[PDB]
Design a binder for this molecule. Structure first.
Ligand SMILES: CN(C)CCCN1c2ccccc2Sc2ccc(Cl)cc21
Ligand SMILES: CN(C)CCCN1c2ccccc2Sc2ccc(Cl)cc21
Lengths: 158, 158
């Protein structure tokens, strides 16, 4: 369903600070409410020395903006990670230059699909957004969002 | 702010049945909740004989999906209509071929801006969506939505 992975991914090199500039999802209800399931705001990507990928992120739960840490285990494919939860959830890195931008998707085999355009600073990278839009033409997305520099510096983008 | 109007608009010819295929807005909160302010689902456009434009639409209010009728008065500019309410609200027709598609925007001078891609049938017109996307490149939109043929036939797109 996501036929776009980064060739030659060096995962150690995605470590550190990231900003969820834009999001997009297969279904409107995955992103429309602040508490919508795919509305996760990346804080930080932390590769483990064994090539697993730890994602630190914020999520609006009930009232507060909550901190969450989730581990995405490595696979044979360098650009694909698994969170064995209620379903097979895969994290796929589509593309990155390591230092400005990183596109990735999360897909639950059930059909549910959300992708993000991550950037290193709180700025609108119009180039990174072009690349994001190009990889989404291929996908059955029905909601897209984008954040301004002010919202990027707030918790949960409020 | 919207520098894209249809040249040579014949307003009588937009009359009758329409479907809100896609929406997009300047701010996420204009479209994110089902009760979000710019989340209006067009039923029908009815030109009056004096060249005023009556919009019949559905809006999710409190619980139910409500019917609403609003009149947009004519101006010197054939493609621009006004709803004199709490602010100057203008309805602008950007483009149409009358028989498949119509792009229009609603703007409140305050900054608040929502645009829609209307189509005549419940079908995904990939061409009409391309034209919609081309007119939005020019605008400071931060949320976009799109509906499937099943949702187009439900009240309020549920
Ligand atoms: C509770 N939330 C931290 C995890 C669920 C949200 N989500 C997600 C987000 C960040 C990292 C991995 C995932 S797995 C996934 C697969 C499909 C969809 Cl649609 C969303 C997600
Ligand atoms: C109560 N709702 C029927 C009218 C308000 C929603 N809305 C709108 C929708 C359909 C026809 C005209 C308008 S004026 C307008 C201007 C700016 C924005 Cl952002 C939204 C709107």
């Amino acid at each position: 369903s996501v036929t776009q992975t980064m060739k030659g991914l060096d995962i150690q090199k995605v470590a550190g600070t990231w900003y969820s500039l834009a999001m997009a999802a297969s279904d409107i209800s995955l992103l429309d409410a602040q508490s919508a399931p795919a509305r996760v705001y990346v804080e930080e990507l932390k590769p483990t020395p064994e090539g697993d990928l730890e994602i630190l992120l914020q999520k609006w739960e009930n009232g507060e903006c909550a901190q969450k840490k989730i581990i995405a285990e490595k696979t044979k494919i360098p650009a694909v990670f698994k969170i064995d939860a209620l379903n097979e959830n895969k994290v796929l890195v589509l593309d990155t230059d390591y230092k400005k931008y990183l596109l990735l998707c999360m897909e639950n085999s059930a059909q549910s699909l959300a992708c993000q355009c991550l950037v290193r600073t709180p700025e609108v990278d119009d180039e990174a957004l072009e690349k994001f839009d190009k990889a989404l033409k291929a996908l059955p997305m029905h909601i897209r969002l984008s954040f301004n520099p002010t919202q990027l510096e707030e918790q949960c983008h409020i």
